[PDB]
Ligand binder design. Structure first.
Ligand SMILES: CCCCCCCCO[C@@H]1O[C@H](CO)[C@@H](O)[C@H](O)[C@H]1O
Ligand SMILES: CCCCCCCCO[C@@H]1O[C@H](CO)[C@@H](O)[C@H](O)[C@H]1O
Ligand SMILES: CCCCCCCCO[C@@H]1O[C@H](CO)[C@@H](O)[C@H](O)[C@H]1O
Ligand SMILES: [Au+]
Ligand SMILES: [Au+]
Ligand SMILES: [Au+]
Ligand SMILES: [Au+]
Ligand SMILES: [Au+]
Ligand SMILES: [Au+]
Lengths: 215, 215, 215
């Protein structure tokens, strides 16, 4: 049973790390809340979505200083995952929370991904078709609506050519990256997009760590 | 010539297993039939696809007792493959045959897959666009039609947001799994859906084995 | 230094090969021209795309004899890449240039791929939606238009059910293959299509090498 040392170690480490991370997540104080982002995004859920982006970033920097990236560190990064393709503008990210502006300028759709995070999306423009698991019918959501993709849930997502939304996620953020880059690794092979994603996540993490040091 | 032992061994094993499986397929008595399933689905291709599903499952359990899964073992499982995403309800499966209810509640499309099985789909609702290999034109099929994906053939499939059909496949069913789970491994990473697929296939195989023991 | 022998060798080989390939591309005469292919395709972008294909192939074989594959070596091969699925008819290909007739008979879309080649597409029929990186809006191109996918650029492409175009690429063609087969390896697993792609590329390379031997 000597070679079972590695297997027992892996099982015990997974159990211990799950216990630690889950207790942390359920006892951790959080910066943002889904209702906050939802109200902020629904206030600006209009036709013009670029002005909505600007106003939302301004409000977030006003009510949460030191937690939103500066304009210098902002860039739209492609996101290929689950068979769909969109783009993201990451405003805030940590090990447990993230806030971004997501959306697509083309018709896409695929698997939503099943990860260890709860994600709220408030549509600013476009249409969002969601197909829940185990059903045979889907629902369409319009600007102003907010869809909550809960932890462990898997749905089919679909977006029209002009869809843009504000997204807030809470959970274990690194695990979500494993999904968010899968198609980038095995389908698109856009290594520059992989670098951009890692770079923006690292910049957000460094901002969050720098704010903690001053406090 | 020890380094060449592995290559000769695998080639010989592949040839022997291919001949054995093909002789089995040419000698095996079959439970279902393509024309039978097509006729059964065509009987109700005028109804709501859920009513059609109910009546088809009832008729299958009547005409083939001991070969269709119990309602307790029935569940809709997502299916991501070839760039498309749908869902399945597996009613019967063996090493050589399978019967299921397939379809999507979103607009999808992709590669049909090229495997060692013949697959018949009878559309109950929606639209089914098929693009055969080597051509520059596609064809759309409507409720009541039956599409035959032959062995070794590869086409492009596309389905609208409300498409549902009855599907019967015959051949070497395990050979298909490599395709039916590929996107689940490298794109969606939905290992829970992979577990569900393995679970329903194992339940169908165990049902088929249990029916053989009583006879 | 022993653990670094492989790493030092790989670094030196990559540097030497990059310099060699760049000096070759800078010191190589080219067979085709981007404006030439664009003009030839736009002159016939008013006909049925099959008649356009025929006339374009005739003109290419007239103005460039010995560089376009014979009709016996021409076949439509499926192309699954970046999440989209179309088909190609390769007319000319070398290590530095390629000319083909691309398009899809289904509605598809995905990642354009980011490789080391500049690619011009002249739409003969259908519609072509392109979404550039860093932007929030896409543009639609119609028959007669020419899209230039530059080196290092990454976009989102989308095509309607009847889209067909003439495509000319120049750069390091092998670098593109890594993209053009990703979905074929990890999603569709249509290894017969992979064989067809390798076969047509090898036929084009052998034709181009045979033309050099006579000269
Ligand atoms: C995200 C793309 C949305 C496209 C909107 C198409 C107009 C409505 O489409 C309908 O939506 C229903 C539920 O979603 C589907 O079940 C129906 O099949 C479909 O006709
Ligand atoms: C390639 C498939 C083209 C389908 C055309 C659908 C009708 C056009 O649709 C419009 O096209 C614009 C251009 O990107 C988008 O910005 C808009 O969001 C979209 O509504
Ligand atoms: C699967 C959903 C299909 C949507 C129906 C679109 C209306 C018909 O669309 C037509 O069908 C033809 C055959 O497929 C295509 O070749 C044409 O390009 C397309 O215009
Ligand atoms: Au941005
Ligand atoms: Au932004
Ligand atoms: Au079911
Ligand atoms: Au069912
Ligand atoms: Au051809
Ligand atoms: Au052709």
């Amino acid at each position: 049973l000597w070679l079972g040392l590695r297997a027992v170690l892996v099982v015990a480490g997974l159990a211990v790390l799950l216990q630690l991370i889950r207790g942390w997540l359920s006892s951790k104080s959080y910066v943002f809340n889904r209702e906050e982002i939802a109200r902020l995004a629904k206030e600006h859920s209009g036709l013009d979505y670029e002005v909505a982006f600007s106003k939302i970033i301004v409000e977030l920097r006003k009510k949460h200083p030191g937690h939103i990236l500066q304009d210098e560190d902002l860039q739209w990064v492609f996101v290929n995952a689950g068979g769909w393709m969109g783009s993201m503008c990451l405003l805030h990210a940590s090990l447990t929370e993230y806030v971004l502006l997501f959306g697509t300028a083309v018709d896409t759709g695929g698997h939503s991904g099943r990860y260890w995070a709860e994600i709220s999306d408030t549509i600013l423009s476009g249409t969002f078709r969601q197909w829940k698991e185990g059903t045979t019918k889907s629902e369409i959501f319009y600007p102003g609506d907010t869809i909550v993709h809960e932890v462990g849930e898997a749905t089919s997502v679909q977006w029209s050519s002009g869809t843009w939304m504000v997204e807030y996620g809470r959970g274990f953020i690194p695990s979500t990256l494993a999904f968010a880059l899968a198609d980038t690794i095995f389908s698109t092979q856009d290594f520059l997009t992989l670098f951009y994603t890692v770079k923006v996540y690292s910049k957000a993490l460094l901002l969050e760590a720098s704010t903690h040091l001053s406090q």
